[PDB]
Amino acid sequence: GEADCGLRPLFEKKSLEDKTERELLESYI
């Protein structure tokens, strides 16, 4: 695991967003 943790092959690594992650980022006021 380690250096590459938390970066999803099908989303962050491709610069694609899932359908509801903006809801999380929008609450980090």
**Total binding residues for another protein by CB under 8 A?**
21
Which helix (H) or strand (E) covers residue 22, if one does? helix 21-26
CB of 10 vs another protein, minimal distance in Å:
4
The interface with another protein within residues 1-29 (CB under 8 A) comprises 1-2, 4-12, 18-21, 23-25, 27-29
8: tokens are: 């999803």
3-state secondary structure of 11: coil
- Around Cβ 11, how many Cβ atoms within 10 Å? 12
Contacting positions for another protein (CB under 8 A): 1-2, 4-12, 18-21, 23-25, 27-29
